[PDB]
Amino acid sequence: HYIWIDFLVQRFEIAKYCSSDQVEIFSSLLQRSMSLNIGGAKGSMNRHVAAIGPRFKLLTLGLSLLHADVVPNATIRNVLREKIYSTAFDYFSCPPKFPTQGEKRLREDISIMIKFWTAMFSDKK
Amino acid sequence: LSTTDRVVKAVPFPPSHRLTAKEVFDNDGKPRVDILKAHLMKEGRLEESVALRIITEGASILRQEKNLLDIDAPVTVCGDIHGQFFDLMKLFEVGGSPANTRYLFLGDYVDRGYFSIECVLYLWALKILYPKTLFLLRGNHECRHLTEYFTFKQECKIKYSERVYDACMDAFDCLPLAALMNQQFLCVHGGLSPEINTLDDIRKLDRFKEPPAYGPMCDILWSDPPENFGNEKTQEHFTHNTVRGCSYFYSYPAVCEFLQHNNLLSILRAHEAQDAGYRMYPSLITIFSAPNYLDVYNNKAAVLKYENNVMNIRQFNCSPHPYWLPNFMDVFTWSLPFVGEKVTEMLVNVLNI
Amino acid sequence: SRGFYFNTVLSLARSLAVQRPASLEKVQKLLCMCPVDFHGIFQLDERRRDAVIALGIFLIESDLQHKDCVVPYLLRLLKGLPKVYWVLPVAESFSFCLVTLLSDVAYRDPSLRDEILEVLLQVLHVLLGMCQADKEYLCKYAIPCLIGISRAFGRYSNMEESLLSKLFPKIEPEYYFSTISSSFSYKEFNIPLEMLRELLNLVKKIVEEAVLKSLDAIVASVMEANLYYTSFSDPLYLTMFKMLRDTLYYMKDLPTSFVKEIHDFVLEQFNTSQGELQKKLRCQANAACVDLMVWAVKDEQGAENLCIKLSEKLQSHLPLLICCLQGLGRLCERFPVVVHSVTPSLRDFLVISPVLVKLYKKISVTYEQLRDIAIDNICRCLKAGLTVDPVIVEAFLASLSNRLYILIPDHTIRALGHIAVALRDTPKVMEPILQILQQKFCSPLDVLIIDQLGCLVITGNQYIYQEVWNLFQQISVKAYRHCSLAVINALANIAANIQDEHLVDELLMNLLELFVQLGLNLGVLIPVIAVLTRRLPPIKEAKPRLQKLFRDFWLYSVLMGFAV
Amino acid sequence: GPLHPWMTLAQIWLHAAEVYIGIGKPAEATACTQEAANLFPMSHNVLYMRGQIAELRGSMDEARRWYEEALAISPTHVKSMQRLALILHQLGRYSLAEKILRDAVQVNSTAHEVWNGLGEVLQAQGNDAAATECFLTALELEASSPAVPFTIIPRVL
């Protein structure tokens, strides 16, 4: 998933300027993955610490799609933002634990978290 | 220029004393129609109680009249008016004063022209003065559906009241439906009906009601001549009018059969504007007396003088009339949205530095 | 408004008919939802009729595939038809549809024509068997079935698309389902004389009057005892005479005895009806009898005798008169000798009969169908008579011109225009026509004259185009007011309906020349210019003259300020 | 007390408006659906009714917008995707319609209109054998369709 998401990111970056039909496909793919079920044992995503890279990378991609001024109307954006917020809050519903991955593969996770933090801070609409 | 006094001083300011019954009706109850005509041509209004008294007494007169008036020739026949009061005045100028001219009107006093209430008041005054020599027929717009859809109801509520409107509507409900003219002509606003083969079918109707959604009276008020004349290869007498959504077109064979069976010569009707004020199709003649329809059509008007078994078409041009904004709208409703829009825009620009 | 079941069934059938070859099991299924026989007595509901119709359309469009299985089912069904239980009448329409698809199938393949025809006469023989043998069932479902099968006896189509296919489109037909006696409108089906003679015997048997009185009486008795028909006599009468005309309309090379017998029968019926009717639906039957009589004329002597009879009739019902004119035209075109006798009567009728004036007809202010029908008859007459006498048309238009020099002039002008347009294939006849039109000026008739000459210009001859351009250019340079809107409408129509490209470009450059001549309410020609130029591809290279005209036109347009 | 009486009232109003839709009187249907929407503004069936009235009016844009908005709330509604596929197919885009039809048949496989639309779309391609099979499936399914779905009766001990 870690490399599949990068492939999706680059393809979306090209398709944002190039065409206007793949945008609907990307929106459908993103919308059917997350869910608004912040709770005990149902979030449609693993909650282990060792898998915080792909999660926040996908959330950052969703935020970037939201910030590109592509979706015409104003009711899909509400749903997308609500789902993103729900998943982000859902991640924080377990006791903290320490990372288990190696020395490498840990720096880039912190970098991705910083990028997502900056993107979230910039959002004001 | 004065900031308080009026700029265009040549227009006299209308009196704010609504005229009373004693000022409009003389000792014997006859309307002073020259005074009334001058006042209404000046856009003057009546007191609510006097308008209501005129309308309901006229309704009571129609109520005491037969369904089928037996009006003899000579007569000047007039078609749609559609609120063009100053053209009704021109019509009477061309045809002759009702003091010495017999008249038959085929309806549409209301709907589209903005002097409908003046038309009603003036025609009602003539009906008061000449109850057995001046006759007024019903058109298809003399009903609640259209007068509530168009502006007549709003006009009544601006100038008089809603209850005055309802009383006027009930008077229109009292209007006879048809005329048998010189034992030769059936005179109606719209035309024929599949369910009317004799004058007695008209005489038997119950007219004291809102016009129904279907049936012979509806067709009488609503029907039209067909698009093609003289080349009607079709054999059906009445066919569905897909433009109007109700009632029927009637064909030339239908008219000829009705005339022959009833020993009639033709049928006199209105309802469709004509550039010349008339059209001769003779089994059928349409006459249309509303010049410059909607202030844009630029059409002539005509009347039909029927006398000595001769139909003499007399044309006349339109006359000037006073201006009204659409739907009798006041200046606050018109301008306040723009004020709020531009003040909001300014505030937005002030803040979006 | 078709629904859902009907539409999807039709879609399935039409998709099946395009897959060639189609597997037999699908057609077996289609017959499976089709009805089946119960002891010789059938039942019918809407869905079963829809299935039968869909199977019929599939067979029609299937390029005649697997007929060996379906055709026996159809003929068994039609054999069982007279006692089919039933749950405009529906029965007559269903019979109309099934007779139609059967007739189309019969035309498509010749190997079965004898079988289909023979079962057809068998079933009408059986129907004739019990019609004159309960009253409710017979009145409700037997005679209406007879009328339904009568509406489409032998009528068939010679088109690239089958006939029933046009009846049910895939997305006028309803008219066929709303009238009383409507119908539809070259291998010459080899029907043996015995079948035709039997059919004539049935026609002669049913046209009897006493049976009509009896059926009317029993219908009245049933009506008073406790339907949509009221009187069967007139619709029947009309139906048998109509299809008697239609079935035998286009047969050739028949024994003379049969022709003589049918001629005697039709003349007897016509004269009896004409004598009785001198005291509505019988007028169409009289027209049918007249058409049959015209078809039943083989000798010249009888031809002019009939022409004299109709000529006496004309100068004494409207469709009867129209059919009389059509029959006179038919006689004139079939026999060239009678031309010298038929032209004077028709010409006098056009230029004078009072019936035309009454049809046009105090009316004081202080028709065309018969007209152009007669004009087309005149054109057919002279185009048929030009084969023998070449000088007849010269004397003819001499007489028309004489009438012109001596309301009526509008009729003469329209007639002359029609002759001029219709006879383009002639020698130099249009030159005298344009000569008399030019010399016949003085005038409200100028509008009709200019419209007529524009119609002539539509033909597209160089010399007449040059002369008409001279006239129109002089008229435009002169500026009457009444002859300006007329000329602009005329040349707009011309530019809308010119075909040859040489004259197109010539008139384009000459219009540009006229516009630049107007260079001292001025730019009224530019709609015509746009209408013309919307018919050509973009201009890349052309004569430098045209480039100069375009440059001058553009500079004048911008200097007057028309560009902004 | 509870919220279900409001559901009953809204369903009453929607059922009343459905009769108006079936006869061709847009104004009364609009009035009734606005009255129903006064209570719940985000219900998907009210958006479906709005799309129905817009389609009856004769607009091919507002109906699309309403159907998309309705499908964005409850992605398991079959009528909305059926109508959207129909209008998209009549528009010209022949790619998304097949995908929507496949999703609809995956969700439920008992609605004959789905099969009919699938076959109609496939007919424009050329593989008419599968189209005929789909038509066969559609009519055999429709041969036994009830007035309302059988799952209305509660499944309770």
Coordinates of C-alpha atoms in Angstrom, one line a residue, chain C residues 68-472:
Chain C
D68 CA -42.3 -24.1 -41.6
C69 CA -43.0 -24.1 -37.8
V70 CA -44.8 -20.8 -37.3
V71 CA -47.1 -20.7 -40.4
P72 CA -49.0 -23.9 -39.5
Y73 CA -49.6 -22.4 -36.0
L74 CA -50.9 -19.2 -37.6
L75 CA -53.3 -21.0 -40.0
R76 CA -54.6 -23.2 -37.3
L77 CA -55.2 -20.1 -35.2
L78 CA -57.1 -18.4 -38.0
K79 CA -59.1 -21.6 -38.6
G80 CA -60.1 -21.6 -34.9
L81 CA -60.7 -17.8 -35.0
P82 CA -64.6 -17.9 -35.4
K83 CA -65.1 -19.5 -32.0
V84 CA -62.3 -17.8 -30.1
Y85 CA -63.4 -16.7 -26.6
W86 CA -63.1 -13.0 -25.8
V87 CA -62.2 -11.8 -22.3
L88 CA -63.1 0.6 -31.6
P89 CA -63.7 -3.1 -30.9
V90 CA -60.6 -5.1 -30.2
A91 CA -61.5 -8.0 -32.4
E92 CA -61.6 -6.0 -35.6
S93 CA -58.2 -4.5 -34.9
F94 CA -56.7 -7.8 -34.1
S95 CA -58.1 -9.4 -37.3
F96 CA -56.8 -6.3 -39.2
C97 CA -53.3 -6.9 -37.8
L98 CA -53.3 -10.7 -38.5
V99 CA -54.7 -10.3 -42.0
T100 CA -52.0 -7.7 -42.6
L101 CA -49.1 -9.8 -41.5
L102 CA -50.5 -12.8 -43.4
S103 CA -50.8 -10.7 -46.6
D104 CA -47.2 -9.4 -46.3
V105 CA -46.0 -13.0 -45.7
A106 CA -48.0 -14.1 -48.8
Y107 CA -46.4 -11.4 -50.9
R108 CA -42.9 -12.1 -49.7
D109 CA -42.9 -15.8 -50.7
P110 CA -44.8 -17.2 -53.7
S111 CA -44.7 -20.9 -52.9
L112 CA -47.6 -20.6 -50.4
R113 CA -49.8 -18.1 -52.1
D114 CA -52.4 -20.7 -53.2
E115 CA -52.6 -22.2 -49.7
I116 CA -53.0 -18.8 -47.9
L117 CA -55.6 -17.6 -50.5
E118 CA -57.5 -20.9 -50.3
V119 CA -57.7 -20.8 -46.5
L120 CA -58.8 -17.2 -46.8
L121 CA -61.7 -17.9 -49.0
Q122 CA -62.5 -20.9 -46.8
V123 CA -62.8 -18.8 -43.7
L124 CA -64.9 -16.2 -45.3
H125 CA -67.1 -18.9 -46.8
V126 CA -67.6 -20.2 -43.2
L127 CA -68.4 -16.7 -42.0
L128 CA -70.9 -16.3 -44.8
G129 CA -72.2 -19.7 -43.6
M130 CA -73.2 -18.6 -40.1
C131 CA -74.0 -14.9 -40.7
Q132 CA -77.2 -15.8 -42.5
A133 CA -77.8 -19.1 -40.6
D134 CA -78.2 -16.2 -30.4
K135 CA -77.7 -12.6 -31.3
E136 CA -75.4 -11.1 -28.6
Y137 CA -72.2 -12.9 -29.6
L138 CA -72.8 -12.7 -33.3
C139 CA -73.5 -8.9 -33.2
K140 CA -70.6 -8.2 -30.7
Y141 CA -67.8 -10.3 -32.2
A142 CA -68.7 -11.9 -35.5
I143 CA -69.7 -9.1 -37.8
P144 CA -67.0 -6.8 -36.3
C145 CA -64.5 -9.5 -37.1
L146 CA -65.8 -9.6 -40.6
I147 CA -65.3 -5.8 -40.9
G148 CA -61.8 -6.1 -39.5
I149 CA -60.7 -8.8 -42.0
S150 CA -62.5 -6.8 -44.7
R151 CA -60.4 -3.7 -44.1
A152 CA -57.2 -5.4 -45.4
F153 CA -58.2 -8.1 -47.9
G154 CA -55.5 -7.8 -50.5
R155 CA -53.8 -4.5 -49.9
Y156 CA -50.0 -4.9 -49.8
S157 CA -46.9 -2.8 -49.9
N158 CA -43.9 -2.7 -52.3
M159 CA -41.3 -1.0 -50.1
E160 CA -37.9 -1.8 -48.7
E161 CA -39.5 -1.9 -45.3
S162 CA -42.4 -4.2 -44.5
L163 CA -45.9 -2.9 -44.0
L164 CA -46.6 -3.9 -40.4
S165 CA -43.1 -2.6 -39.4
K166 CA -44.3 0.9 -40.2
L167 CA -47.4 0.3 -38.2
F168 CA -45.4 -0.3 -35.0
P169 CA -42.3 2.0 -34.9
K170 CA -39.3 1.6 -32.6
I171 CA -39.2 4.4 -30.0
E172 CA -50.0 8.4 -38.0
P173 CA -50.6 4.7 -37.1
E174 CA -53.1 5.6 -34.4
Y175 CA -55.2 7.2 -37.1
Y176 CA -55.7 3.7 -38.6
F177 CA -57.0 2.7 -35.2
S178 CA -59.4 5.7 -34.8
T179 CA -61.5 5.8 -38.0
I180 CA -64.3 3.5 -39.3
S181 CA -63.3 2.5 -42.9
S182 CA -59.7 3.6 -43.4
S183 CA -57.3 1.4 -45.3
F184 CA -53.7 1.4 -46.7
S185 CA -53.2 3.6 -49.7
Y186 CA -45.4 -5.2 -59.4
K187 CA -45.4 -9.0 -59.7
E188 CA -49.2 -9.3 -60.3
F189 CA -50.2 -12.2 -58.0
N190 CA -51.4 -15.2 -60.0
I191 CA -54.8 -15.6 -58.5
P192 CA -56.7 -18.1 -60.6
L193 CA -60.0 -16.9 -62.1
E194 CA -62.0 -19.3 -60.0
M195 CA -61.0 -17.5 -56.7
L196 CA -61.8 -14.1 -58.2
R197 CA -65.1 -15.3 -59.5
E198 CA -66.0 -16.7 -56.1
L199 CA -65.0 -13.4 -54.5
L200 CA -67.3 -11.6 -56.9
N201 CA -70.1 -14.0 -56.0
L202 CA -69.6 -13.2 -52.3
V203 CA -69.6 -9.5 -53.1
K204 CA -72.9 -9.8 -55.1
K205 CA -74.4 -11.9 -52.3
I206 CA -73.6 -9.5 -49.4
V207 CA -74.7 -6.3 -51.2
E208 CA -78.3 -7.5 -50.9
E209 CA -80.6 -5.2 -49.1
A210 CA -83.1 -7.5 -47.4
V211 CA -80.2 -9.0 -45.3
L212 CA -79.3 -5.4 -44.4
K213 CA -82.9 -4.7 -43.1
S214 CA -82.9 -8.0 -41.2
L215 CA -79.6 -7.2 -39.5
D216 CA -80.6 -3.7 -38.7
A217 CA -83.9 -5.0 -37.1
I218 CA -82.0 -7.6 -35.0
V219 CA -79.5 -5.0 -33.9
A220 CA -82.3 -2.7 -32.9
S221 CA -83.9 -5.6 -31.0
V222 CA -80.7 -6.3 -29.2
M223 CA -80.2 -2.7 -28.3
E224 CA -83.7 -2.3 -26.9
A225 CA -83.3 -5.6 -25.0
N226 CA -80.5 -4.2 -22.9
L227 CA -72.2 -2.1 -28.2
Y228 CA -70.5 0.6 -30.3
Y229 CA -72.0 0.0 -33.7
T230 CA -75.4 1.5 -34.5
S231 CA -76.2 0.6 -38.1
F232 CA -74.1 -1.9 -40.0
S233 CA -75.6 -1.4 -43.5
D234 CA -73.8 1.8 -44.5
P235 CA -70.3 0.8 -43.1
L236 CA -70.6 -2.6 -44.7
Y237 CA -71.8 -1.3 -48.1
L238 CA -68.9 1.1 -48.1
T239 CA -66.5 -1.7 -47.1
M240 CA -67.4 -4.2 -49.7
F241 CA -67.5 -1.6 -52.5
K242 CA -64.1 -0.2 -51.3
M243 CA -62.2 -3.4 -51.3
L244 CA -63.9 -4.6 -54.5
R245 CA -62.4 -1.5 -56.1
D246 CA -59.0 -1.9 -54.3
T247 CA -58.5 -5.6 -54.9
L248 CA -59.2 -5.4 -58.7
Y249 CA -57.6 -1.9 -59.1
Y250 CA -54.4 -3.2 -60.7
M251 CA -55.1 -6.4 -62.6
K252 CA -54.3 -6.8 -66.3
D253 CA -54.8 -9.5 -69.0
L254 CA -58.2 -10.9 -67.9
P255 CA -60.9 -12.6 -70.0
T256 CA -63.3 -10.2 -71.5
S257 CA -66.4 -12.0 -70.2
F258 CA -65.4 -11.2 -66.6
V259 CA -64.7 -7.6 -67.4
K260 CA -68.1 -7.2 -69.2
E261 CA -69.8 -8.9 -66.2
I262 CA -68.2 -6.7 -63.6
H263 CA -68.9 -3.6 -65.8
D264 CA -72.6 -4.5 -66.0
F265 CA -72.8 -5.1 -62.3
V266 CA -71.0 -1.8 -61.4
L267 CA -73.1 0.3 -63.8
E268 CA -76.3 -1.3 -62.6
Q269 CA -75.4 -0.6 -58.9
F270 CA -74.3 3.0 -59.8
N271 CA -77.4 3.9 -61.7
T272 CA -79.7 2.4 -59.1
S273 CA -77.9 4.3 -56.3
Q274 CA -77.9 7.5 -58.3
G275 CA -81.6 7.2 -58.9
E276 CA -82.3 6.5 -55.2
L277 CA -80.1 9.3 -53.9
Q278 CA -82.0 12.2 -55.6
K279 CA -84.6 12.4 -52.8
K280 CA -73.7 10.5 -46.7
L281 CA -71.4 7.4 -46.7
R282 CA -72.9 6.3 -50.0
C283 CA -71.0 9.1 -51.8
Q284 CA -67.7 7.3 -51.3
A285 CA -69.3 4.2 -52.7
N286 CA -70.5 6.2 -55.7
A287 CA -67.0 7.4 -56.3
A288 CA -65.7 3.8 -56.1
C289 CA -68.3 2.7 -58.7
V290 CA -67.2 5.6 -60.9
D291 CA -63.6 4.5 -60.6
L292 CA -64.5 0.9 -61.4
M293 CA -66.4 2.1 -64.5
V294 CA -63.4 4.1 -65.7
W295 CA -61.3 1.0 -65.2
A296 CA -63.9 -1.0 -67.1
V297 CA -63.6 1.0 -70.3
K298 CA -61.7 -0.6 -73.2
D299 CA -63.2 1.1 -76.3
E300 CA -63.0 4.7 -77.5
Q301 CA -66.8 5.0 -78.2
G302 CA -67.6 4.2 -74.6
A303 CA -64.8 6.5 -73.5
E304 CA -66.4 9.6 -75.1
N305 CA -69.9 8.4 -74.1
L306 CA -68.7 8.4 -70.5
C307 CA -67.0 11.8 -71.0
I308 CA -70.2 13.2 -72.3
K309 CA -72.1 11.8 -69.3
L310 CA -69.7 13.4 -66.8
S311 CA -69.7 16.6 -68.8
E312 CA -73.4 16.8 -68.4
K313 CA -73.0 16.0 -64.7
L314 CA -70.4 18.8 -64.0
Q315 CA -72.6 21.7 -65.2
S316 CA -75.6 20.8 -63.1
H317 CA -71.0 15.1 -53.0
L318 CA -67.7 17.1 -53.0
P319 CA -65.5 14.0 -53.0
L320 CA -67.8 12.6 -55.7
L321 CA -67.0 15.7 -57.9
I322 CA -63.3 15.3 -57.1
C323 CA -63.4 11.7 -58.2
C324 CA -65.3 12.7 -61.3
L325 CA -62.5 15.1 -62.2
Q326 CA -60.0 12.4 -61.5
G327 CA -61.9 9.9 -63.8
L328 CA -62.1 12.5 -66.5
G329 CA -58.3 13.0 -66.3
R330 CA -57.8 9.2 -66.4
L331 CA -59.9 8.9 -69.5
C332 CA -58.1 11.8 -71.2
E333 CA -54.7 10.4 -70.4
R334 CA -55.6 6.8 -71.4
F335 CA -57.2 7.9 -74.7
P336 CA -55.6 10.8 -76.7
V337 CA -58.5 11.3 -79.2
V338 CA -60.9 12.5 -76.4
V339 CA -58.5 15.4 -75.6
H340 CA -60.2 17.7 -78.2
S341 CA -63.5 17.0 -76.4
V342 CA -62.3 17.2 -72.8
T343 CA -60.2 20.4 -72.9
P344 CA -63.1 22.8 -73.8
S345 CA -65.3 21.6 -70.9
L346 CA -62.6 21.8 -68.3
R347 CA -61.3 25.1 -69.6
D348 CA -64.9 26.6 -69.5
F349 CA -65.4 25.2 -66.0
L350 CA -62.2 26.9 -64.8
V351 CA -62.8 30.2 -66.5
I352 CA -66.5 30.5 -65.8
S353 CA -68.8 27.0 -63.5
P354 CA -70.9 28.8 -60.8
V355 CA -70.0 26.0 -58.3
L356 CA -66.5 27.4 -58.1
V357 CA -67.9 30.9 -57.4
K358 CA -70.2 29.6 -54.7
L359 CA -67.3 27.7 -53.1
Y360 CA -65.4 31.0 -53.1
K361 CA -68.6 32.7 -51.9
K362 CA -73.5 40.6 -48.0
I363 CA -69.7 41.0 -47.5
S364 CA -68.9 44.7 -47.6
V365 CA -66.0 46.5 -46.0
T366 CA -65.7 50.3 -45.9
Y367 CA -61.6 26.3 -53.7
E368 CA -57.9 26.1 -54.2
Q369 CA -58.0 22.3 -53.9
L370 CA -60.3 21.9 -56.9
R371 CA -58.4 24.7 -58.6
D372 CA -55.0 23.1 -58.6
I373 CA -56.5 19.6 -59.1
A374 CA -58.1 20.9 -62.3
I375 CA -54.8 22.6 -63.2
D376 CA -52.8 19.3 -62.7
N377 CA -55.5 17.6 -64.8
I378 CA -54.9 20.1 -67.6
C379 CA -51.1 19.5 -67.4
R380 CA -51.6 15.7 -67.6
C381 CA -54.0 16.3 -70.5
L382 CA -51.7 18.3 -72.6
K383 CA -48.6 16.2 -71.8
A384 CA -50.6 13.2 -72.9
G385 CA -51.9 14.9 -76.0
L386 CA -48.6 16.4 -77.1
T387 CA -47.6 12.9 -78.5
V388 CA -50.1 13.2 -81.4
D389 CA -50.8 16.8 -82.0
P390 CA -47.8 19.2 -81.6
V391 CA -49.8 22.4 -82.4
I392 CA -52.5 21.8 -79.8
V393 CA -50.7 23.6 -77.1
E394 CA -50.0 26.7 -79.3
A395 CA -53.7 27.2 -79.9
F396 CA -54.4 26.4 -76.3
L397 CA -52.2 29.1 -74.8
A398 CA -53.4 31.4 -77.6
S399 CA -56.9 30.9 -76.2
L400 CA -55.7 31.5 -72.6
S401 CA -54.0 34.7 -73.7
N402 CA -57.2 35.8 -75.5
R403 CA -59.1 35.2 -72.2
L404 CA -56.4 37.2 -70.5
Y405 CA -56.9 40.3 -72.6
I406 CA -60.6 39.9 -72.5
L407 CA -60.1 37.8 -60.1
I408 CA -60.3 35.6 -63.2
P409 CA -57.0 37.0 -64.4
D410 CA -55.4 35.6 -61.2
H411 CA -56.7 32.2 -62.2
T412 CA -55.3 32.6 -65.7
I413 CA -51.9 33.8 -64.4
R414 CA -51.6 30.8 -62.0
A415 CA -52.6 28.4 -64.7
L416 CA -50.1 29.8 -67.2
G417 CA -47.4 29.7 -64.5
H418 CA -48.2 26.0 -63.8
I419 CA -48.1 25.1 -67.5
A420 CA -44.8 27.0 -67.9
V421 CA -43.2 25.3 -64.9
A422 CA -44.5 21.8 -65.7
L423 CA -43.4 21.9 -69.4
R424 CA -39.6 22.6 -68.9
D425 CA -38.9 19.6 -71.2
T426 CA -40.6 21.4 -74.2
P427 CA -39.1 23.5 -77.0
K428 CA -38.9 27.3 -76.7
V429 CA -42.3 27.8 -75.1
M430 CA -41.2 29.8 -72.1
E431 CA -40.0 32.7 -74.2
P432 CA -43.6 33.6 -75.3
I433 CA -44.7 33.1 -71.6
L434 CA -42.1 35.6 -70.3
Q435 CA -43.0 37.9 -73.2
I436 CA -46.7 38.0 -72.3
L437 CA -45.9 38.4 -68.6
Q438 CA -43.6 41.4 -69.4
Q439 CA -46.2 42.9 -71.7
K440 CA -49.1 42.3 -69.4
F441 CA -48.2 45.0 -66.8
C442 CA -51.0 47.4 -66.2
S443 CA -52.0 47.2 -60.2
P444 CA -52.2 44.8 -57.2
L445 CA -51.7 41.8 -59.5
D446 CA -48.0 42.7 -59.8
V447 CA -47.3 40.7 -56.6
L448 CA -48.8 37.6 -58.2
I449 CA -46.9 38.3 -61.4
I450 CA -43.5 38.7 -59.6
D451 CA -44.1 35.6 -57.5
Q452 CA -44.9 33.6 -60.7
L453 CA -41.8 34.9 -62.5
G454 CA -39.7 34.0 -59.5
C455 CA -41.1 30.5 -59.7
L456 CA -40.1 30.4 -63.3
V457 CA -36.7 31.7 -62.4
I458 CA -36.3 28.8 -60.0
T459 CA -36.0 26.7 -63.1
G460 CA -32.5 28.1 -63.8
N461 CA -32.1 29.2 -67.4
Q462 CA -29.3 31.7 -68.2
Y463 CA -31.2 33.9 -70.7
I464 CA -34.3 34.3 -68.5
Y465 CA -32.0 34.8 -65.5
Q466 CA -30.3 37.7 -67.4
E467 CA -33.6 39.3 -68.4
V468 CA -35.1 39.0 -64.9
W469 CA -31.9 40.5 -63.4
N470 CA -32.2 43.4 -65.8
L471 CA -35.8 44.0 -64.7
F472 CA -35.1 43.6 -61.0

